From Swiss-Prot, chains A, B, C, D, E:
It is linked to Amyotrophic lateral sclerosis 10: A neurodegenerative disorder affecting upper motor neurons in the brain and lower motor neurons in the brain stem and spinal cord, resulting in fatal paralysis. Sensory abnormalities are absent. The pathologic hallmarks of the disease include pallor of the corticospinal tract due to loss of motor neurons, presence of ubiquitin-positive inclusions within surviving motor neurons, and deposition of pathologic aggregates. The etiology of amyotrophic lateral sclerosis is likely to be multifactorial, involving both genetic and environmental factors. This is TAR DNA-binding protein 43. RNA-binding protein that is involved in various steps of RNA biogenesis and processing. Preferentially binds, via its two RNA recognition motifs RRM1 and RRM2, to GU-repeats on RNA molecules predominantly localized within long introns and in the 3'UTR of mRNAs. In turn, regulates the splicing of many non-coding and protein-coding RNAs including proteins involved in neuronal survival, as well as mRNAs that encode proteins relevant for neurodegenerative diseases. Plays a role in maintaining mitochondrial homeostasis by regulating the processing of mitochondrial transcripts. Consists of an N-terminal domain (NTD) and two tandem RNA recognition motifs, RRM1 and RRM2, followed by a C-terminal glycine-rich region.
Length: 36, 36, 36, 36, 36, 41, 41, 41, 41, 41
């Protein structure tokens, strides 16, 4: 009856002369409850 | 009956001569409740 | 019957000669309740 | 019957010779209640 | 029957020789209640 | 350097009726925000 | 350098009726955000 | 350098009726975000 | 350099009825994000 | 350099009825993200 945790946690890091770029296409949940 | 936590937590970091750029396309939840 | 927490928490950081730019396309929730 | 928290909390930081610019396309909730 | 909190809290910071500029495209809620 | 769009909503009520229809956050936008990185200490 | 779109929603109620229909976050957008990296210490 | 799309939702209620229909996060977008890497210490 | 699409949802209620129908995160997008690597220390 | 698609959902309720139907994360996307490697120390 209870779902729980829905976590999307995107995080980026880089260091020490590194290079870092990105682009997200699509991201998301899609969730549902039934009871009868 | 209770959903829970819906968390999107995007975070960016970089250091020490790094480079960092980004662009998000689409992001979001899509959620629903039924009871009968 | 109770949803819970709907959290979008985007945050940006960078340090120490870093570079940081971004642009978001689309962001948002899309949520719903039914009971019958 | 009760939704909960609808939080968008965008925040920006950078330090120590960093550079930081951004532009948001679209942002927002889209939410709904039904009971019958 | 009760919604809850609808929070958009955009905040900007930067320090220590940093640079910081931005421009928002669109921002806002879009929310609704039904009961029958 | 954009295009075009057209919006004609038809909303009518009737006997013992009500419709609410809050809507609309729409258009097009363009962004010029390039930059160049800083230099050494 | 975009295209085109068309939106005609038909919403009608009737006897003992109500419709709410909150909608709309729509269009097109374009991004120029290139950069060049920093240099040494 | 995009295309085209068309959206005509038909929503009608009736006796002792309600429909809610929250919807819409839609369009097209384009991205220019190239860069060049930094140099030595 | 895209194509095309068409969306016509038909949603109708009736006696003692309700439909909710939250939907829509849709379109097309394109990405230019190439780069060149950094150099030595 | 894409194609095409068409989406017509038919959703109707009836007496003592409800349908919810949350849906939609759809389209096409293209990626330009090549790079060149760094050099020596």
């Amino acid at each position: 009856m209870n779902f729980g945790a829905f976590s999307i946690n995107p995080a980026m890091m880089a260091a020490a002369q590194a290079a870092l770029q990105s682009s997200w296409g699509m991201m998301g949940m899609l969730a549902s409850q039934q009871n009868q």
